[PDB]
Design a protein around this ligand. Structure first.
Ligand SMILES: C[C@@H](Nc1ccc2c(c1)OCCn1cc(N3C(=O)OC[C@H]3C(F)F)nc1-2)C(N)=O
Ligand SMILES: [Cl-]
Lengths: 1031, 255
């Protein structure tokens, strides 16, 4: 099983300075050697064999070099310690003892499996113990994707190796919006080219006025041209010299490991596009190619041991069975209920297709708690041939509390879902024992269809036995060729231009949001015009819901339409992968759309949801898991966050096997980056252990005493070696060097978060940032903050493309474990309470503070930036419905950039607690913020600055209302995550009320200004141009 | 015009809660001029619209009905068989049944009882949230101790293999030292075996003590799970009652 906690020993957080280790020699002797806490295994071995001569039978002992230590780790594994440079405290031992044996077996493979296992958080050998054929087949079959990606990584070597490790961070399109192009001086960009110049190795610089659409090679070409102007070289001589520097030098962003390798326009890069928007001169460096390729080693992929082993292991089609479906519920082992409160228990069953039930739910006869015996055949209203490929059985032992008599309250106790068809298209048959899972927090529904399929690994849980039908044959699902034959016959038995009103009705349905009320007449209208829907391909998610999935005639006809359906946008394809569409052909079409059209920018952006979508999939081996792993192994930026999103949920036993097997395939083929990820994992494990001591052991201690303990533990060499010289988990381009322990401190915020400061070891750190500060926090779940900040970045990106400079600050946030995560520190930022405390305080204190920091010409830029950022957050916070804002969670930068921190909750979270139906305005625009926007005025609302701010808010509100389908699907893809704020589709309906999708576009503008007027007691006003919208 | 089956302006969230876990035939009408029926069929809430044109109603053209009440009463007696769905309107959810929850008549007494139910719901929710945290940490600690028991088994197996290793080597050398006449050396091999066997007893006792704590924590987990499954039906009923008292003050007020 995975490790219990990041401690050094079982029931002990830190070993004392000296500790007795019970070393067991190969001659049957036991030596109690006193080892220091942070001593290497080579030093322990050298001192052990010196003492071994004193103990009996020392002549049988061989040379100390021909031996390695082996011991039981906290994950109940007999780990072999080949890397003898590791310290005693960093070995994760269960008890203080070390057995001595000769190295045996494949040394290279055992080291690699230890490295893979350390990154996952569980041993690799536990997957070999799993008897499930699907798990063993997934490990063997997924290796083709591993070698497919690795072959192309060393095809155009050394360039292809650099493209994987340092991919080009670029936008999804080279076209620039109107506000960005006007900032460039007549379609040109000014850039400083910094370079360390031999022999003295000095930092030289020179200004360059070049075109914005120049590729990285064209930037190098113009840099040589300007430098050779004084020399007066010939046209051909210059062109020959340019070709040498182009083929031997490449550009790099100063202060971070971000390179410009692929031929993309300079302005398309995120660092350049941000510099144009902010009005900053970019800083680049011409790094020599030889220096970069020498640091990048060759990544090898050795086939695993389980792949080279010998395999351990009449048919009737589904449409041949003429009987109805029936499933027998036999018995449950035990149920945890009070006899005095609960009257009786029963197994509620249901056949589902993702979310919609295929037939009416059938329950077992009510039996008492002491005797859970049923042995009843439950007949469902569904013909076996009509069952679709994604058919599932959802069941749970429900209770009944008939104490009131008039009303009997039913509640679930333990749930479990079974895939009716296995990974090899075989319908389930015979007996089956299923261990049930606990009911998720807040779930009141008697069944959990969203939940994962399969038995619970923890066998000390209620075990329910079942018995499926046996028709004296192995029942398989029909082939695609058989399905296509039935579809042609269905069309033939039924049997050109279409009316304009019908075309306009179809156009209107496609533009509606995913959770819009689709009528039964509209379903018949969509199904009748199914072949006409090829001209408008965006209507496929609406057409699929209208298909009667509990009927083989309508399913087969839909399969043929999906096969030859035109391609759709990547944002539209994500909709077809949530819990509502589990059909393999629908999911396959969506994955095919993302393979061709989804760019690496959008894949990195919507990666949080795509990892959660893997949980809705019925089987381990599927087209989506192959696509995501292929992109993770060909791009290190995608691969890094892909690793951390899967690592964070390893504690959750519902996904431990699925995510653990996927991480094994990733770590085996990622190559050199596995060693870099192990350095990050080991650094995060020490931070978890260090915070656990300050919460349990030093709980009732003073801040001065805790700070003394914090510095003393960090100064030790074991902690210094692990937390210095490793890549930042919030951004792999940024790297963390030597720690600045004088700046590290325990913060006074909730759950005492630890402030950490690292020196940027990049040669040109002074140009971007010297201090890489990161707040480590253990206690609160930062999955909600991750989703909120990700959605803020998407809202910002949509506004920027439309021509809106509403500068948002989606700071880095990443969950790395069970309520463990990291938060990026925004430099030169303070809370409203901190600004007010500097100065008793007046409403003009925030404005006076900004006047002191920004003096002269930079005052107008600060007010503009404050208004632009404030308008964005006023709209973003209202739509999402984040926790109520206050002075301690609103921050403002020195330059005037306003941003929100500590989101915690979203949507109508407080509705279930209080019971008041109302769309709140979390960020209330108080007089303090209005005085800053209005540049110091008594009548703040009656100003041109406030009128421009109003326009900024209405522009951003309609921008999100236009792309509302994307935001609804992003939340729908996070339902299975297991977060308390997002569990059922009723929680998503809050954003529908704020965006006013049911009402017209003019009514949405009238609604938004009314919501602002109610919160701010007047100020906002209507315009005459609103009536001219198309309704 | 008004009827128990007609509810008026109702949100989609409330519609799903009325039809949740109901038999085929349950239905309700709500305002979208036009009105939308919601009939249950195969565990799904099927939405069937009622169009209005020149004083005529119906699900689809031709419109052969004078009023909405006539359309509902016609399909209540006769089966649908317009679409091809073999079901009919049978169980109408009523508005007067919800009124019996709020038994008080005057506005002051409704507000007095709401303050009591809201205070009781906050106390019950605080109890449920603290009991859920106890349930979660107990489940995690049981998993931590279960992993530790497996590690103790492998730890004992290695020390038992060390005893077996010493037994194999010692039998050859015990004759060599006895025939030589080196009783001082024989006592050292025997003392080292007793030292190793004493450590085995201490590790077995450590595993036995953690097995008793795991057994005790499993019984505590069962009692916390029993309490969690008993507080949930009381919490959701107390919340539903509070929502009815809030809806009573909304309907008996200015709008
Ligand atoms: C020292 C100085 N700088 C500072 C302080 C806090 C943050 C910050 C910079 O960077 C901006 C992101 N940020 C996010 C959060 N936090 C969150 O989101 O939750 C609570 C809380 C932290 F404790 F986690 N806190 C911060 C100051 N103003 O005091
Ligand atoms: Cl358990």
């Amino acid at each position: 099983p995975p490790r219990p906690s990041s401690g050094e020993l079982w029931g002990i957080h830190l070993m004392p300075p000296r500790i007795l280790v019970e070393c067991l020699l190969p001659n049957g002797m036991i030596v109690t050697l006193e080892c220091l806490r942070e001593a290497t295994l080579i030093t322990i071995k050298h001192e052990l064999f010196k003492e071994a001569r004193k103990y009996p039978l020392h002549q049988l002992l061989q040379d100390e070099s021909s031996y390695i230590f082996v011991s039981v780790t906290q994950e109940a594994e007999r780990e072999e310690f080949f890397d003898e440079t590791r310290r005693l405290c960093d070995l994760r031992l269960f008890q203080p003892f070390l057995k001595v044996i000769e190295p045996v077996g494949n040394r290279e493979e055992k080291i690699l499996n230890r490295e893979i296992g350390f990154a996952i958080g569980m041993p690799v050998c536990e997957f070999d113990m799993v008897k499930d054929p699907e798990v063993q087949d997934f490990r063997r079959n997924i290796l083709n994707v591993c070698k497919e990606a690795v072959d192309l990584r060393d095809l155009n070597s050394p360039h292809s190796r650099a493209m994987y490790v340092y991919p080009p961070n670029v936008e999804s399109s080279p076209e620039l919006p109107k506000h960005i192009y006007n900032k460039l001086d007549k379609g040109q960009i000014i850039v400083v080219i910094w370079v360390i110049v031999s022999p003295n190795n000095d930092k030289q610089k020179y200004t360059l006025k070049i075109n914005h659409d120049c590729v990285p090679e064209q930037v190098i070409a113009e840099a040589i041209r300007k430098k050779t102007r004084s020399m007066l070289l010939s046209s051909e001589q210059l062109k020959l010299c340019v070709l040498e520097y182009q083929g031997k030098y490449i550009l790099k962003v100063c202060g971070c490991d971000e390179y410009f390798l692929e031929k993309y326009p300079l302005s398309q890069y995120k660092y350049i596009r941000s510099c144009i928007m902010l009005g900053r001169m970019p800083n680049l460096m011409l790094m020599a190619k030889e220096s970069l390729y020498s640091q990048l080693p060759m990544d090898c992929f050795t086939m695993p041991s389980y792949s080279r082993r010998i395999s351990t292991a009449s048919t009737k089609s589904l449409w041949v069975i003429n009987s109805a479906l029936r499933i027998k519920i036999l018995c449950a082992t035990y149920v945890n209920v009070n006899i005095r409160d609960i009257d009786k228990i029963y197994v509620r069953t249901g056949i589902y297709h993702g979310g919609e039930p295929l037939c009416d739910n059938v329950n077992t006869q009510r039996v008492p708690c002491s005797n859970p015996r049923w042995n009843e055949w439950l007949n469902y209203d569904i013909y076996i041939p009509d069952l679709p490929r994604a058919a599932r059985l959802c069941l749970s032992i429900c209770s009944v509390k008939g104490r009131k008599g008039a009303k009997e309250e039913h509640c679930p106790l333990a749930w479990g879902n079974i895939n009716l068809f296995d990974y090899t298209d075989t319908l389930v048959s015979g007996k089956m024992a299923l261990n049930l899972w606990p009911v998720p927090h807040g779930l009141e529904d008697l069944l959990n269809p969203i939940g994962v399929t399969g038995s619970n690994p923890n066998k000390e849980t209620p075990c329910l036995e079942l018995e499926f039908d046996w028709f004296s044959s192995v029942v398989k699902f029909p082939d695609m060729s058989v399905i296509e034959e039935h579809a042609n016959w269905s069309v033939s038995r039924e049997a050109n231009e279409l009316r304009e009103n019908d075309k306009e009705q179809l156009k209107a349905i496609s533009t509606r949001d995913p959770l819009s009320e689709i009528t039964e007449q509209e379903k018949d209208f969509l199904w009748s015009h199914r072949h006409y829907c090829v001209t408008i391909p965006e209507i496929l998610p609406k057409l699929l819901l209208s298909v009667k999935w509990n009927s083989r005639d309508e399913v087969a006809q839909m399969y043929c339409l999906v096969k030859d359906w035109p391609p759709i946008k990547p944002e539209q394809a994500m909709e077809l992968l949530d819990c509502n569409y589990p059909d393999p052909m629908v999911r396959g079409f969506a994955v095919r759309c993302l393979e061709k059209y989804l760019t690496d920018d959008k894949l990195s952006q919507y990666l949080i949801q795509l990892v959660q979508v893997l949980k809705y999939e019925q089987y381990l081996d599927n087209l989506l898991v192959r696509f995501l792993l292929k992109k993770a192994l060909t791009n290190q930026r995608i691969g890094h966050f892909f690793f951390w999103h899967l690592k964070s949920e390893m504690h959750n036993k519902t996904v431990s096997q699925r995510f653990g097997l996927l991480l094994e395939s990733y770590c085996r083929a990622c190559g050199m980056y596995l060693k870099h990820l192990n350095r990050q994992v080991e650094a995060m494990e020490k931070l978890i252990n260090l915070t656990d001591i300050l919460k349990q052991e030093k709980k009732d201690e003073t801040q001065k005493v805790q700070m003394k303990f914090l510095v003393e533990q960090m100064r030790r060499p074991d902690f210094m070696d692990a937390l210095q010289g490793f890549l930042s988990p919030l951004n792999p381009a940024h790297q963390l060097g030597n720690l600045r322990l004088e700046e590290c401190r325990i913060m006074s915020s909730a759950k005492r978060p630890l402030w950490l400061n690292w020196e940027n070891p990049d040669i040109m750190s002074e140009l971007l940032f010297q201090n890489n500060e990161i707040i480590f926090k253990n206690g609160d779940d930062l999955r909600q903050d991750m989703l909120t900040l990700q959605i803020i970045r998407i809202m910002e990106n949509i506004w920027q493309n439309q021509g809106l400079d509403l500068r948002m600050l989606p700071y880095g946030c990443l969950s790395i474990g069970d309520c463990v995560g990291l938060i990026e520190v925004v430099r030169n930022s303070h809370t409203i309470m901190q600004i007010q405390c500097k100065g008793q305080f007046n409403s003009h204190t925030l404005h006076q503070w900004l006047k002191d920091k920004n003096k002269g010409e930079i005052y107008d830029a600060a007010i503009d930036l404050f208004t632009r950022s404030c308008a964005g957050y006023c709209v973003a916070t209202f739509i999402l419905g984040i926790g109520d804002r206050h002075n301690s969670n609103i921050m403002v930068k020195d330059d005037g950039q306003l941003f929100h921190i500590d989101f915690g909750h979203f949507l109508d979270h407080k509705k279930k607690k209080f019971g008041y139906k109302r769309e709140r305005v979390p960020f209330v625009l108080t007089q303090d913020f209005l005085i800053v926007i209005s540049k110091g005025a008594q009548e703040c609302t009656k100003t041109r600055e406030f009128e421009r701010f109003q326009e900024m808010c209405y522009k951003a509100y309609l921008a999100i209302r236009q792309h509302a389908n994307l935001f609804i699907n992003l939340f729908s893809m996070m339902l299975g995550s297991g977060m308390p704020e997002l569990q059922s589709f009723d929680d998503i309906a809050y954003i529908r009320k704020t965006l006013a999708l049911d009402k017209t576009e003019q009514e949405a503008l009238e609604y938004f200004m009314k919501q602002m007027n109610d919160a701010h007691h007047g100020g906002w006003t209507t315009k005459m141009d609103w009536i001219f919208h198309e309704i | 015009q008004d009827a128990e089956w007609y509810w008026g302006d109702i949100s989609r969230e409330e519609v799903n809660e009325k039809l949740r876990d109901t038999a085929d035939g349950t239905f309700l009408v709500r305002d979208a001029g036009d009105y939308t029926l919601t009939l249950r069929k195969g565990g799904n809430n099927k939405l069937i619209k009622i169009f209005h044109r020149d004083g005529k109603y119906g699900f689809s053209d031709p419109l052969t009905f004078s009023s909405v009440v006539e359309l509902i009463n016609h399909y209540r007696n006769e089966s649908l068989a317009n679409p091809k769905l073999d079901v009919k309107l049978l169980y109408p959810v009523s508005k007067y049944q919800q009124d019996q929850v709020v038994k008080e008549d005057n506005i002051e007494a409704v507000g007095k009882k709401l303050h009591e139910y809201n205070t009781q719901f906050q106390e019950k929710s605080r109890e449920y949230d603290r009991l859920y945290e106890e349930y979660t940490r107990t489940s995690q600690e049981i998993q931590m101790k279960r992993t530790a028991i497996e590690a103790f088994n492998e730890t004992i197996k290695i020390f038992e293999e060390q005893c077996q290793t010493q037994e194999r080597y010692s039998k050859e050398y015990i004759e060599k030292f006895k025939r030589e006449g080196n009783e001082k050396e024989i006592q050292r091999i025997m003392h080292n075996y007793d030292k190793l066997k004493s450590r085995i007893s201490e590790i077995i006792d450590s595993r036995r003590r953690l097995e008793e704590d795991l057994k005790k924590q499993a019984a505590e987990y069962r009692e916390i799970d029993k309490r969690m499954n008993s507080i949930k039906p009381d919490l959701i009923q107390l919340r539903k009652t509070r929502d009815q008292y809030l809806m009573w003050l909304t309907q008996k007020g200015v709008r």
